[PDB]
């Protein structure tokens, strides 16, 4: 409890939210006309406590898609149902570029982590193996509505269908990773894509999803229903990688100066955590060169130096 | 308080250190004869508390060189008397090997972090500029007495001499850094890389180690004589380093299994932080494959599964 | 007219032939069935010279596939339609690895040279654009047929099917080259890929493919017809890149001890080319680990200390 | 004999000079005074064929640094005198940047290939050992005057001086070196670079040069006094180098343009050799981005357009 009165809280989380308002930079993703579409002045934080306790400020119901935000939550599904030691048999822990800029694989024929495209494909193909796309999805969207304690889990078929049909790259990670036998026993690598833009696809708010991002940083229970959503060891492994391979190149410079778990998108999404103290989401369309959000990058800075939330602090 | 009660803590620590003292895998380095002298069976850990409550077990009290858990320290110092923005302006903060594999310095012609040598050198020449060598060793030995309240703080002149004369790759490194003007405004190269070589053979023990590493877990407190030896923000930017560049290509899994900043030497040392609890310092000659200790590898992931001191667990 | 005495000549390069039948070394290509049927004591020479003076020995009239031994001659044949500048434009000249071990493409987004897959590929798609893929195959087969003075030139279905069944890598390089943007404005890739593994997939004899090599060594003159096929440009350029980048990773080793423009491939087929004096095809199943035919290379060494053929001798 | 007429190809060489004459972008090279002092608007050009024939013009009698045109004729001396084996057991022969742009030794730990400086430095290692370097100085100058036919072969000892001075990145080699055991045993590292810096500082004027260049596109005989200067080994050898490495990054785009053995150096001068027919010495201090004087390679450029000297002609 490093939060003695939520109110005051709440009271500079306006203060902060204000501040970052007045960061305009950036540009608003548009690879795809789905992500163009959105105005650069959208911008909203909520935050949604161990607790409970919740607050919201500006744009917080306008429904965006998580696009690789979703990746430490599959990834904690895989862990959650697999175990770290199967999962990491297809994908490594590694935060470095070690000397891989850009590269699909490691030397062991590895994606370097789950935080980068390669290492999302692979781990999709872990989850609910053996039945239909369509089985795969739904049982990905009642998790999601667990984890974020029923609140608003939808789906973009738009992008969806423009992420599939410009995907070039991912589509050649797709082929590279079946050449190099990285995924399980008998899997169809194109249906393993579909899904995957699927995943990218599914819809949140930064209301939902600070209930998210709550559940991993109460141990794996949502913080508003109280039930068991992802086991200990799940949480764990999700919180490290987010760490270390969450925010894209910028990971060391965040690491450092902000020093939480966190996973940036392409929509201008940054999903927060404050182990055991409350989970977050900033968002603001409109990104810097890294690919993050530029507003939610300021929040996050002014948010560790005013409140001292700093893992090492 | 994760620790209720120190004796029944004491006497879990005993027990991981009589487990990891079943592992003889590994090897002395010996790229000099003073380090190669060292047996192979010498194993000793030692804890200090934020209390200032201690515990020892095993060859805790015969002496050994830093080597590069040297590094955090000498870092902590420089940031500590120059602030973090001055320090960094020299040196990276990224705990990647990027895209950098062995090379000396990054794309900014800077240095990766303050964990590798090159980064080490650096940080070498911003400590304390302007005065005579000598004056500038007495000044880091002063501040590692603080850090170590008083506690053993030796210096091996053997060490000294055979790791100038036997330290090619240090003077190549030392040479290319000259050469993209790394170094401050009229830097002596040379007698810098002597200041390096003679801070790598500071000795310790394993129970004065501990104190110091009891110090950054106390937010740079000595916890036995209660004087502020470090600056808040010194011991921040130190252990955010440590716990991603700390444990040379290791880190990444290191990162991951135990969590925890730590920082290891060719003597075969780990000193080892546990924010807000306490200061640890393993020390076994034996080094595995990455550079590290076998048993201090050993015991650092059994404490963290027994105790659960995992930054996120 | 380095060489006097045809018959002669003709007599040292059965003693070439023959002590590099000794060298039983390799391995067959496996990675599909119509590679692996081969059997490794299949070894053929055959030359051609620019006079039109032939010569043959061993197993120089059984088919097999060129493989990337075709990559210099639809190279040839891009330049001699389109030109020099048109075609670089599209892919490098770089016979380096510069610091692309294995990347698709270089810095500039484009492909390192036409001698490697994504060059083959790209170089694939500037071919008689415009028109459905059995015309620009027919057109393909004719060059060919010219450039063999209408001897042997077939196709295998077989080696076609499985080459694209099993060619996950190209399809991951055809992915890449869509998402830079590499192939000519309203290039349907996945055509381009069929076109280019049916051009591997091309069948000559050790005879037939000798006359090509020999028509290359002629300035684009077919020695058996007397017929322009190709321009003094192209001919010049292939060369230049086939002294550089023909034998794959082994090109540097080759160009210092043999001198000669060569392609490989991994049918176990060597077009050597021996500048305004003649062309060869040597062929033999088992590949070093370079991918190039054993007793190819060997015979080549031979060949160039023996007849001093080296371009600087 | 691709010159029928000397005096007219003399009157198309004068045309060429003049042509590039024109050509007046470029820097001269400014990282030490003795190169910065030289004016952007010296040109000259001196031929001499194997016959013995001369022509020079422009500035063909000013004396300036060898530089990197060193690098093949020291290559050359080594080899002569100890053969092709013995010398590669210490560098390489690979003409790419493979995957190490930068890197001083590949991964066998061996330079890249005798022309890039670490290359250099251990061919400058294995020349004469045993003797001093007044001794080895002498020995290398008696060589030179006889590749140059006895014509101007001086020495620049503030060139030398300041080289040595300012020369950080050359010792940062020489450390490396000498850490994984690159040179032969007892080698005196420091010693060595004094003796490199020597020989990098040793001067020419067009005319002399070109009488070297001449003797290894002779070869090994000089065309002014028929003696046998270097082995028909060595020659070869250093032409295939010279060929796939003599020209920086521009190597590769200079072997496909011009296809001609050549050497640059950052004094302006580039030693380029025409295989049985002539040696030339084009020298304009203005280097462009690559480090190549800009009139020497548009001359060359245009001498091989008009005179159709390349290798694949
Ligand atoms: S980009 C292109 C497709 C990829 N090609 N290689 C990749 N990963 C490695 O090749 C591993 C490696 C990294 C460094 C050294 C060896 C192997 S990914
Ligand atoms: S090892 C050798 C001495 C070094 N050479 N280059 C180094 N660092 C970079 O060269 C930076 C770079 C990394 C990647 C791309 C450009 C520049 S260190
Ligand atoms: S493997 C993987 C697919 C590729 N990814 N990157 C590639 N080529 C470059 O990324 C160019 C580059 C080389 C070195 C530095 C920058 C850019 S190919
Ligand atoms: S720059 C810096 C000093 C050097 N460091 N490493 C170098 N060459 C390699 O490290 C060989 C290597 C290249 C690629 C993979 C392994 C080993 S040179
Ligand atoms: N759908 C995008 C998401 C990019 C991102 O969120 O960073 C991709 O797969 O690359
Ligand atoms: N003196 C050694 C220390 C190595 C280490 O502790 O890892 C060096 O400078 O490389
Ligand atoms: N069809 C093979 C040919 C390989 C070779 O000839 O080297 C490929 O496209 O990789
Ligand atoms: N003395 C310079 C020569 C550079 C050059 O000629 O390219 C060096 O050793 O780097």
Redesign the pocket.
Known sequence: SMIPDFMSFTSHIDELYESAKKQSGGKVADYIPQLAKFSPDLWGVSVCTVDGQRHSTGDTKVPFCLQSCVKPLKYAIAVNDLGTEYVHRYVGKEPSGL??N??????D?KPHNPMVNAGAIVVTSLIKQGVNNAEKFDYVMQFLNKMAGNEYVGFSNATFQSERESGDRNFAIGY?LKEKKCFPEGTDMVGILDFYFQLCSIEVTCESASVMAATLANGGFCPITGERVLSPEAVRNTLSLMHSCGMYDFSGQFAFHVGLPAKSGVAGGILLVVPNVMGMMCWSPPLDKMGNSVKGIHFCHDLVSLCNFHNYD
Chains 1, 2, 3, 4 share one sequence.
């Open positions: 000397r891989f850009k590269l699909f694989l490691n030397e024929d590279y």
